[PDB]
Amino acid sequence: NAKRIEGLDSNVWVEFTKLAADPSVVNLGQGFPDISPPSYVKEELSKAAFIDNMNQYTRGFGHPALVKALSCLYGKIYQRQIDPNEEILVAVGAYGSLFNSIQGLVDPGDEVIIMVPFYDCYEPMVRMAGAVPVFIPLRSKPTDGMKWTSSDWTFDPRELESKFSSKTKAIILNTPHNPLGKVYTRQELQVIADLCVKHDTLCISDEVYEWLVYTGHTHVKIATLPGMWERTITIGSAGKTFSVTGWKLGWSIGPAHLIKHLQTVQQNSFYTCATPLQAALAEAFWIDIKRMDDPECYFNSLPKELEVKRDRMVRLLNSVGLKPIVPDGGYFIIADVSSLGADLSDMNSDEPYDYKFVKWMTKHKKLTAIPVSAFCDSKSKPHFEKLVRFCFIKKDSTLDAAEEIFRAWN
Amino acid sequence: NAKRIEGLDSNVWVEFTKLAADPSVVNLGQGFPDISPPSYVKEELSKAAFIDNMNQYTRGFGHPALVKALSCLYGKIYQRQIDPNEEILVAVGAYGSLFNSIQGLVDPGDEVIIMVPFYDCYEPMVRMAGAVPVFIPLRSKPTDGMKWTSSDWTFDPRELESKFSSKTKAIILNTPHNPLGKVYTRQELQVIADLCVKHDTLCISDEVYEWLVYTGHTHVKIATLPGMWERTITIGSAGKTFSVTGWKLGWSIGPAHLIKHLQTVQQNSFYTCATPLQAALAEAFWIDIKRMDDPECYFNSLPKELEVKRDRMVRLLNSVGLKPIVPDGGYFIIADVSSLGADLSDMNSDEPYDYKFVKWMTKHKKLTAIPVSAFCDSKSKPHFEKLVRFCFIKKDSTLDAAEEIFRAWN
Ligand SMILES: [Ca+2]
Ligand SMILES: [Ca+2]
Ligand SMILES: [Ca+2]
Ligand SMILES: [Ca+2]
Numbered sequence: 001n002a003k004r005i006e007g008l009d010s011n012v013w014v015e016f017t018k019l020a021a022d023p024s025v026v027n028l029g030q031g032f033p034d035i036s037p038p039s040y041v042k043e044e045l046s047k048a049a050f051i052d053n054m055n056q057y058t059r060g061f062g063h064p065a066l067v068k069a070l071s072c073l074y075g076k077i078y079q080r081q082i083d084p085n086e087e088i089l090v091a092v093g094a095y096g097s098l099f100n101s102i103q104g105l106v107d108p109g110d111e112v113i114i115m116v117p118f119y120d121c122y123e124p125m126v127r128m129a130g131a132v133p134v135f136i137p138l139r140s141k142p143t144d145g146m147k148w149t150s151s152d153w154t155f156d157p158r159e160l161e162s163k164f165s166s167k168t169k170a171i172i173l174n175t176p177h178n179p180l181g182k183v184y185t186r187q188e189l190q191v192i193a194d195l196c197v198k199h200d201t202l203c204i205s206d207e208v209y210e211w212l213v214y215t216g217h218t219h220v221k222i223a224t225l226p227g228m229w230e231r232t233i234t235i236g237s238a239g240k241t242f243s244v245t246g247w248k249l250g251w252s253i254g255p256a257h258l259i260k261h262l263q264t265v266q267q268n269s270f271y272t273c274a275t276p277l278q279a280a281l282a283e284a285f286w287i288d289i290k291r292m293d294d295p296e297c298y299f300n301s302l303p304k305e306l307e308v309k310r311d312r313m314v315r316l317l318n319s320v321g322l323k324p325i326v327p328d329g330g331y332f333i334i335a336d337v338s339s340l341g342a343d344l345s346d347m348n349s350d351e352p353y354d355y356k357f358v359k360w361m362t363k364h365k366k367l368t369a370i371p372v373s374a375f376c377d378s379k380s381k382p383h384f385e386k387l388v389r390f391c392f393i394k395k396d397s398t399l400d401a402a403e404e405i406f407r408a409w410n
Numbered sequence: 411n412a413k414r415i416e417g418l419d420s421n422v423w424v425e426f427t428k429l430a431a432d433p434s435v436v437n438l439g440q441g442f443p444d445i446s447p448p449s450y451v452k453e454e455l456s457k458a459a460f461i462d463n464m465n466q467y468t469r470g471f472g473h474p475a476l477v478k479a480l481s482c483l484y485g486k487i488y489q490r491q492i493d494p495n496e497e498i499l500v501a502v503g504a505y506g507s508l509f510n511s512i513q514g515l516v517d518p519g520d521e522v523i524i525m526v527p528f529y530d531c532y533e534p535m536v537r538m539a540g541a542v543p544v545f546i547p548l549r550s551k552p553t554d555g556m557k558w559t560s561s562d563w564t565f566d567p568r569e570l571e572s573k574f575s576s577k578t579k580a581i582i583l584n585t586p587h588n589p590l591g592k593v594y595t596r597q598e599l600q601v602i603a604d605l606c607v608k609h610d611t612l613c614i615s616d617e618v619y620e621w622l623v624y625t626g627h628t629h630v631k632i633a634t635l636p637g638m639w640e641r642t643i644t645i646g647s648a649g650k651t652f653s654v655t656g657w658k659l660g661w662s663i664g665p666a667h668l669i670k671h672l673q674t675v676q677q678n679s680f681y682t683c684a685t686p687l688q689a690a691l692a693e694a695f696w697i698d699i700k701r702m703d704d705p706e707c708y709f710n711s712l713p714k715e716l717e718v719k720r721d722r723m724v725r726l727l728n729s730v731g732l733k734p735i736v737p738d739g740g741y742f743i744i745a746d747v748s749s750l751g752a753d754l755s756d757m758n759s760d761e762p763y764d765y766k767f768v769k770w771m772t773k774h775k776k777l778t779a780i781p782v783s784a785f786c787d788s789k790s791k792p793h794f795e796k797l798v799r800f801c802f803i804k805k806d807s808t809l810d811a812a813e814e815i816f817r818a819w820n
Contacts, residue, residue: 001671002517009674032466042459045686049455052446057655092502092680099679107412124678245467246685261411264419268534269509270502274684275656
């Protein structure tokens with residue numbers, strides 16, 4: 001194997017599929033919506049399937065109708081004209097956008113700052129570019145008294161400063177956050193932005209859950225803050241926007257001098273994305289761009305729908321004494337498990353607590369979830385190994401089955 | 411920009427799409443079928459769109475249904491049990507497969523051997539992995555007096571051997587060849603295998619056109635030669651197989667100890683490919699796998715439809731004193747332009763003759779083609795710059811429109 005990939009071959013994630021394969025199991029593990037996608041999204045793929053051109057090669061950097069849709073949508077959000085050709089790159093999901101960003105912008109021996117826990121691909125991507133990941137953890141503050149929330153988790157601004165050096169190339173920001181559900185505050189984004197302009201670094205901003213923020217919170221884009229447009233790449237995703245995870249289309253939005261470099265990676269890796277999916281997606285975006293101020297709009301109706309399910313899941317978790325962190329955004333909820341019965345001495349292995357716990361819960365209680373330490377650099381794992389992540393973008397019937405289990409739990 | 415991407419940002423192929431901005435111009439340039447895809451390819455994409463699961467994430471290394479079909483198809487071809495999980499990897503086109511191969515197996519300072527002319531992504535992919543491309547040209551033999559064919563182009567076994575050394579990691583082989591149409595002989599393939607075995611090098615075999623061989627020629631896979639299975643990655647395409655170029659799905663077939671590395675690259679770049687495309691494709695495969703001896707099988711019916719279109723193009727090219735090289739395979743035809751009225755004063759300074767001629771033919775005859783020099787390293791262009799490539803995977807309307815131009819040439 002080539003050197004750039006030494007030690008990047010870990011997949012405990014096929015293990016988590018194996019656990020979940022048994023069909024008498026309620027799988028609340030991986031982020032697999034089992035709700036229907038919007039009808040019109042399915043319809044549009046079908047319509048595009050029957051047009052010959054829509055089955056042939058389209059523009060390398062994104063299908064013109066799609067990048068037209070995206071520029072119009074984000075134009076509104078940024079309050080800025082966004083250039084469909086120079087300031088957007090369409091790629092194989094947000095995943096591939098992250099790849100373009102890091103491969104195009106990051107050099108061997110560069111430092112990249114990562115907030116732990118992190119969407120897990122951030123570490124191997126930075127190492128493959130020959131760069132050094134520099135970890136800083138989220139820490140929790142005291143609670144309001146009533147409930148534990150995502151907002152009770154923050155970073156230490158002075159600790160963050162301590163991470164930046166002349167070697168810092170970039171920082172990777174993920175908001176709304178996976179796995180916490182944290183919606184970063186304008187004050188938190190201002191601390192980060194301060195350090196990027198101060199240190200002349202870039203910010204890679206992973207905002208795939210931009211539409212899933214709940215009551216009392218607002219998605220704020222760091223790229224919109226003073227001095228940040230020049231230096232930010234902001235990444236979105238079709239899968240997350242339209243509950244169509246199997247489409248694997250995402251976008252990078254930022255200034256032309258940075259998008260250039262992303263574009264070169266794309267050109268030299270896979271060249272172009274699929275035409276029918278992009279065609280269809282552009283129609284779907286149009287359907288929703290035109291009704292943004294209605295509850296009918298998918299950007300509004302989905303978080304309204306999901307918030308109910310969030311609250312249902314909180315209660316269910318509480319009903320067995322798992323201690324839930326109610327999320328500000330996204331469609332994951334994390335739950336501390338330590339105050340349940342520590343049952344695992346006899347499961348013999350130096351695997352972190354939560355892998356063990358999840359394995360136990362799958363065997364005995366017929367429910368799977370994800371161990372939060374799967375989202376942690378090796379030195380950070382002990383500080384998170386009592387934490388377990390559940391996904392709730394599920395239909396009622398699935399949550400019912402989950403309810404069946406928690407009722408019967410004792 | 412990251413050092414890895416330095417001077418790999420040229421796409422002279424954007425000037426070519428600019429020449430395609432038709433003031434009523436018959437576009438015979440890029441490999442863009444304008445025949446309809448098989449009706450059932452389209453049908454299956456639509457059916458898939460309506461299944462909720464088919465719109466959500468699938469196995470990262472390739473949709474189960476798809477890897478199974480590939481396994482059964484290619485097992486019939488290789489004469490072996492091919493493991494659908496460990497010996498196949500599904501990627502974003504064959505383009506993505508090549509990228510998987512180079513990033514997975516090639517290190518800085520490795521030498522990779524390429525044959526000129528070459529599909530043009532080969533050079534920058536090699537360079538982006540920090541390796542050094544080593545070029546060997548194809549050369550003409552004396553013709554049989556009667557006609558010029560792809561089989562009049564060959565390599566010199568002694569010249570090829572001289573390009574092998576201990577720095578050589580791999581050789582990229584492309585058969586049937588693009589742009590030339592050459593279906594490599596068993597005798598030719600034997601020379602490559604000998605050198606790969608003697609030198610313990612890899613072979614990356616790009617075989618996207620493997621179904622497009624015309625009468626009096628057979629696709630043979632180097633991977634099937636004695637000693638080659640354990641050292642070859644062989645690449646296929648959804649786009650080329652089912653005339654569906656915009657679907658961007660391709661696969662690498664080969665030994666576990668090589669595929670595991672390609673799997674790593676994919677896992678840290680794009681992760682999973684589109685579910686509905688892959689679901690649909692699997693079903694298309696099953697349809698044709700079950701009818702392989704029938705003239706209805708797309709594998710048989712397509713080369714048959716195309717041979718007629720090739721022959722038609724040979725006449726038309728001849729009809730105006732463009733000397734065509736008849737291809738054994740694929741859907742491109744190269745023609746020698748040199749002995750036309752070959753005077754082009756309008757464009758000064760020596761960027762290549764074929765670029766000037768393609769620009770001339772656009773403006774004056776409303777026909778585009780691709781200049782062969784664009785598939786050559788800088789030292790090789792002079793030897794190939796009187797050659798021009800035309801695409802004939804075109805509906806009768808389009809070739810009728812072609813006839814009218816050749817008719818009105820003189
Ligand atoms: Ca190793
Ligand atoms: Ca502008
Ligand atoms: Ca700096
Ligand atoms: Ca050797």
